[PDB]
Design a protein around this nucleic acid. Structure first.
Length: 111
DNA sequence: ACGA
């Protein structure tokens, strides 16, 4: 929804070693339940933000690839829920608003 | 539906 929230939800400096543990955070609760999916971008905030430089309002597909760790919910249980993990290096699509990534829009391509 |  905004740059601060995008960073808090999607940007981390080190690789995810356990999706179950990282997803156990109230930031990933929507509608009272554990979120369906969340992609972690293993990079610095500055490098991710650079995707949006010069972009005022549009989805942008990054020109460089990023190391990604995607956590996908396997079952809706009382917190903490179980998640499966997928790792890949790929371009990412983010919504750029006023030069800031504000929403994670896709992996490999924009919608 | 990985934000309004």
């Amino acid at each position: 929804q905004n740059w601060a929230t995008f960073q808090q939800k999607h940007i981390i400096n080190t690789p995810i070693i356990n999706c179950n543990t990282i997803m156990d955070n109230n930031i990933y609760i929507v509608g009272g339940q554990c979120k369906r999916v969340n992609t972690f971008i293993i990079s610095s905030a500055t490098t991710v933000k650079a995707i949006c430089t010069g972009v005022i309002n549009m989805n942008v597909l990054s020109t460089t690839r990023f190391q990604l760790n995607t956590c996908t919910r396997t079952s809706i249980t009382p917190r903490p829920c179980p998640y499966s993990s997928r790792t890949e290096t790929n371009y990412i699509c983010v919504k750029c608003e006023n030069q800031y990534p504000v929403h994670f829009a896709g992996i490999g391509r924009c919608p």
